[PDB]
């Protein structure tokens, strides 16, 4: 009390205080190199003089020096909070390597002098946030998409699937689609423009072949104008649904891995048959890339066509989908029973970074 | 250790807690079965096996007007209480008006509902 909640992602950092409705400070997980030194949005504005660095790739920390800088910026510049005076809740990807779990614990205690910390699996926090202890979470962010079967509060690690296609790949796909139109979005800022185009204008086609026919005939019923920062207008037509379609058919961008629905189906099949029924009934979407309109209905139809006859399929798509991980964490670290769940400074000093394991 | 966990599953019977501002608070026995539709509850049913051991069924009940912190806490409390019971409890998610026959059978005169409840912890 009061616990700090930090959800570290491949592209975005979700941070705030335990007991809040939402994260108060949401900023990109980027380091700007003209060490570091520019961190956050300030590395996006003065990006013309710097080169961008991402300490987290596909949900996994690959640079601990830069990661440690993101944390310092999170505490000092964003939350404006002394970390040695607060317990800190962190998040990790499913199947996170133990070396990174120990390094994360080491940094918090040794570099930040944190009184107490705890690490939660992201998918689990999302399920909790939806008010469930059992279900299959489809976490889909900027750098990685995870399919996590969870039973009675614990992930089933052998059934977890991972695909490295996500939001960033979709952004580049849209850039590719705009390239064949004559445009040349290539720079740092230009990539950010297209990303905004994707978030604002895109949607999931219920029937892709039918929508593709519709856009080629009644084109006016799909076309939307987008105002570029220079004032010019670009027409966006079939790109609106062709871009997020790659989530269901990755072959569009030249990937061999199966689509979102197939990968979820195979995870369910890797689970005990006695729980598959409950998993179909509790499919929970999380992450920014699951925000596309009509994605819940599309997935629902896809899963039904794969599932056994008369199987009940429910896809839950919470409006706060982008922050479900943080929210689940805020609730978790606010509970009266979580006081004794923390890993204390005392427990670290006589066990080391190997303390995270239980 | 949370004092309510220590009271949990000591003997055959029915135990009900209501989530109140990020905490588990025991419902007074005379109010068992009368659920605030604006709240979330945790219910432990303990049954003596025919061999000395105890049987555990954990039911978390979600009112239609309960807030996200309450429903979230109820699910988390359920896992934590199951952990305390060495994972030997079977967990059940109960929705208002769609409760399982087992959960309904716990209350002889049937489930009652009433508007209102404790305010959100958020
Ligand atoms: N309204 C929206 N529609 C479509 N996509 C969106 C929307 N909002 C955000 N996104 C996408 O979500 C991605 C980031 O989401 P999120 O923060 O959940 O992932 P992350 O944690 O940063 O990355 P990862 O989870 O892969 O480590 C971005 O690529 C962004 O394009
Ligand atoms: Ca994430
Ligand atoms: Ca309430
Ligand atoms: Ca159990
Ligand atoms: Na179900």
Residue numbers in the entry:
A (entry chain A): 5 to 38, 50 to 373
B (entry chain G): 28 to 149
From the paper:
Malaria parasites have two actin isoforms, which are among the most divergent within the actin family that comprises highly conserved proteins, essential in all eukaryotic cells. In Plasmodium, actin is indispensable for motility and, thus, the infectivity of the deadly parasite. Plasmodium actin I is abundant and expressed throughout the life cycle of the parasite, whereas actin II is present only in the gametocytes and mosquito stages, including sporozoites, the highly motile form of the parasite, transmitted to the vertebrate by the mosquito. Although Plasmodium lacks a gelsolin homolog, the mammalian G1 is bound between subdomains 1 and 3 in both Plasmodium actins, similarly to other actin–G1 complexes.
